[PDB]
Structure formats: C-alpha cells, structure tokens
Design an enzyme around this catalytic site. Structure first.
Site, PDB file in Angstrom:
ATOM      1  CB  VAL A  62      -5.192   2.934  -5.135  1.00 57.92           C
ATOM      2  CG1 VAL A  62      -4.246   4.445  -5.557  1.00 57.92           C
ATOM      3  CG2 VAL A  62      -4.391   2.471  -3.669  1.00 57.92           C
ATOM      4  CB  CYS A  63      -9.807   4.400  -2.894  1.00 62.12           C
ATOM      5  SG  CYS A  63     -10.214   2.989  -1.819  1.00 62.12           S
ATOM      6  CB  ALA A  64      -8.028   6.772   2.119  1.00 61.55           C
TER       7      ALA A  64
END
Length: 102
Positions: A62-64
C-alpha cells in the site's frame, strides 16, 4: 499484476490468518497514521530489506494512491516474493482506524 481493492483487503480483517500489509510511503507520510500492524518499509529502502519478506507469504503493498505500490509489487515479484497491489492505496482506505506510534 495481482491487485486487491481496499474493501476486499478490509474484509480479510475478518479472517483467521493475519494478513501481511506493507506500507511503502515515506516516513513523513506514515507518521500521520498507518494501518495497524502494517510493516513500514519506505519504497526507497525496499532493496535493503529483502529479508523482511519470505517466500511463503502473500504481501499486500500500500502507498498513498496505488502508484508507488505497483512498482514495489514488480520489484518483489522479480525477487520471488508474492505481492499484491492495494488499489487506490491510502486514498481509498481512508484515514479512520489508523495507528500512530507513541
């Protein structure tokens, strides 16, 4: 590329086996709150942390916004590690129920 929506990943909180979530955002971003129990491994530091992953587990990355995370999925697959991109990232996940460390 394997991919999962945030809703489907949330559904796995209802499951018996704990899910491996890796947050690859920068320290500045994760400092504002991250998913409880996520491994925090900023993208730029990932090649220095191959020994945080093993070949038996699936890792949800997961990232932004689900962009950085896709590049990390490719990098992990080239290293023999099952990885799944979390679609929409933290943008989709929202900012509720997050942890911040004292």
């Amino acid at each position: 590329m394997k991919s999962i929506t945030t809703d489907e990943l949330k559904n796995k909180l209802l499951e018996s086996k704990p899910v491996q979530i890796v947050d690859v955002r920068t320290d500045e971003e994760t400092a504002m709150g991250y998913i409880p129990n996520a491994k925090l491994i900023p993208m730029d530091t990932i090649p220095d942390n191959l020994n945080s992953f093993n070949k038996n587990e699936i890792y949800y990355i997961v990232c932004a916004g689900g962009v950085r995370s896709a590049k990390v999925v490719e990098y992990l697959e080239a290293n023999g590690i099952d990885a799944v991109n979390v679609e929409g990232g933290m943008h989709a996940w929202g900012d509720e129920g997050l942890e911040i460390k004292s």
